Amino acid sequence: PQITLWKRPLVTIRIGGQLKEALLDTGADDTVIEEMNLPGKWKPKMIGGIGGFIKVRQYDQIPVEIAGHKAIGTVLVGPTPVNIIGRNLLTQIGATLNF
Amino acid sequence: PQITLWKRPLVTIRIGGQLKEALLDTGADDTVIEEMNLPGKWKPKMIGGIGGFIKVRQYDQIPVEIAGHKAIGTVLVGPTPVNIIGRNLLTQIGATLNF
Ligand SMILES: CC[C@H](C)[C@@H]1NC(=O)[C@@H](NC[C@@H](O)[C@H](Cc2ccc(O)cc2)NC(=O)[C@H](C(C)C)N2CCCC2=O)Cc2ccc(cc2)OCCCNC1=O
């Protein structure tokens, strides 16, 4: 799909067998999902953007379906204002910026 | 041009007569530029990132050139680690997300 930026680039994803809305964020190195229960082990981590640092749970090798496209990677779960799909998963589905 | 996401999408921009490196952020509603002495009238504003909010100064109708592409719009100046080009300016240069 070719997505324009007149509106926030939000898409439906499926993670942990659950449907959610996430933002395709080219300015994010990583993927940060709102607090939820994900199968498997996790290691505590700390990330920081504008506004400050937050504590997150790091889940590895998690399957995520973005708009029908499969990806399997690291997902950070924490107190984020929005679900963010970062470059680690965007590269897996072959997403690019064009102008 | 087509930009892959293996690395952060950093490009050269021109603002206030100066050249800077900025991140193309599809997850940013606004454009946030690092602290600089831009002339003109402004208004206080608070924007939120992943870890909280920061105080910024809002400047309107600021001419910004992105990768040789002219644009003009609102720029928020504040204490940011990186210059961020948001959707308000990306739409003007016809940027899209494709996968
Ligand atoms: C500041 C940019 C704009 C203003 C902001 N958008 C972003 O920050 C969006 N993009 C995040 C991106 O700007 C930001 C840029 C950046 C890069 C390196 C740094 O050292 C510091 C900041 N990236 C990150 O915060 C990501 C994080 C999401 C994993 N980080 C942290 C360090 C490395 C990295 O990539 C994400 C978001 C979207 C909506 C949000 C909050 C956050 O709430 C709704 C409110 C609207 N907020 C926004 O539109």
Swiss-Prot record, chains A, B:
It comes from the Viruses. The chain holds residues 491 to 589 of 1437 of the full protein. Homodimer, whose active site consists of two apposed aspartic acid residues. It comes from Human immunodeficiency virus type 1 group M subtype B (isolate ARV2/SF2). Residues 1-5, 49-55, 88-99 are annotated as: Dimerization of protease. Residues 20-89 form the Peptidase A2 domain. Aspartyl protease that mediates proteolytic cleavages of Gag and Gag-Pol polyproteins during or shortly after the release of the virion from the plasma membrane. Cleavages take place as an ordered, step-wise cascade to yield mature proteins. This process is called maturation. Displays maximal activity during the budding process just prior to particle release from the cell. Also cleaves Nef and Vif, probably concomitantly with viral structural proteins on maturation of virus particles. Hydrolyzes host EIF4GI and PABP1 in order to shut off the capped cellular mRNA translation. This is Protease. The gene is gag-pol. The lineage of its organism: Viruses, Riboviria, Pararnavirae, Artverviricota, Revtraviricetes. Signal peptide: none annotated. The active site is at D25.
